[PDB]
Amino acid sequence: SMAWHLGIRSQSRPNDIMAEVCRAIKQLDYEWKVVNPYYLRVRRKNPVTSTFSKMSLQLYQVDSRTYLLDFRSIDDEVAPRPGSHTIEFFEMCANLIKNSCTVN
Amino acid sequence: SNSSVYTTFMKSHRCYDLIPTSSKLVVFDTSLQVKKAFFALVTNGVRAAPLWDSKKQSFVGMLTITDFINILHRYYKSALVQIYELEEHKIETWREVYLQDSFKPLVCISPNASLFDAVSSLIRNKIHRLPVIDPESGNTLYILTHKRILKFLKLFITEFPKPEFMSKSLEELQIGTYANIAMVRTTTPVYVALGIFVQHRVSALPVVDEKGRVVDIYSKFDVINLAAEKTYNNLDVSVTKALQHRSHYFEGVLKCYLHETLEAIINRLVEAEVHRLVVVDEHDVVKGIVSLSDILQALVLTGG
Amino acid sequence: GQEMYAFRSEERFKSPPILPPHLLQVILNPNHVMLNHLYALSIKDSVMVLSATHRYKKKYVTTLLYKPI
Ligand SMILES: Nc1ncnc2c1ncn2[C@@H]1O[C@H](COP(=O)(O)OP(=O)(O)O)[C@@H](O)[C@H]1O
Ligand SMILES: Nc1ncnc2c1ncn2[C@@H]1O[C@H](COP(=O)(O)OP(=O)(O)O)[C@@H](O)[C@H]1O
Ligand SMILES: Nc1ncnc2c1ncn2[C@@H]1O[C@H](COP(=O)(O)O)[C@@H](O)[C@H]1O
What is the DSSP annotation of A13-80? -HHHHHHHHHHHHHHTT-EEEEEETTEEEEEEE-TTT--EEEEEEEEEE-SSS-EEEEEEEE------
CA-closest candidate to residue B260, choices B170, B163, B164, B150 = B170
Q: Which residue of A has its CA nearest to B134?
A: A84
Report helix, strand or coil for B178: coil
Q: Which residue of C has its CA nearest to B38?
A: C66
Q: Which ligand is nearest to the CA of B221?
A: 2
Bridge partners of A72? A56, C37
Resolution of the structure in the document, Å: 2.5
Q: Write the single-letter amino acid at A10.
A: S
Q: Which residues contact B235 (CB under 8 A, 6 or more apart)?
A: B72, B76, B189, B190, B191, B194, B226
Query: What domain range is B172 assigned to?
Result: 1-304
Cα–Cα distance between C57 and C30 in angstroms, integer?
15
Inter-chain touch A79–B52, beta carbons under 8 Å: no
Binding residues of B for ATP: 47, 62-67, 107, 128-129, 147, 219-222, 246, 254, 275-276
Number of domains chain B contains: 1
Report helix, strand or coil for C65: strand
Chain B residues within 8 angstroms (CB to CB) of chain A? 27, 43-44, 52, 54, 56-59, 105-110, 113, 121, 133, 135-140
CA-closest candidate to residue A61, choices A38, A94, A91 = A38
Number of domains chain C contains: 1
Ligand 3: which atom is nearest the Cα of residue B201?
17
Cα–Cα distance between C39 and B180 in angstroms, integer?
49
On chain A, the residues whose CB falls within 8 A of the CB of B107 are 78-79
Cα–Cα distance between B229 and B73 in angstroms, integer?
17
CA-based nearest distance A7→chain B, Å: 19
On chain A, the residues whose CB falls within 8 A of the CB of B57 are 46, 48-49, 82-83, 88
Query: What domain range is C67 assigned to?
Result: 1-69
DSSP B227: G
Report helix, strand or coil for B236: coil
Q: Which helix (H) or strand (E) holds B291?
A: strand B286-291
Ligand 2: which atom is nearest the Cα of residue B218?
27
Chains that touch C (3 or more CB pairs under 8 A): A, B
CA-closest candidate to residue B285, choices B195, B189, B178, B191 = B178
On chain B, the residues whose CB falls within 8 A of the CB of C57 are 16
Count of alpha carbons within 13 Å of C36, Cβ hemisphere only? Answer: 13
Q: Are A42 and A57 in contact (CB under 8 A)?
A: yes
Q: Are B184 and B192 in contact (CB under 8 A)?
A: yes
Q: What CATH superfamily is the domain A7-76+84-104?
A: Kinase associated domain 1, KA1 (3.30.310.80)
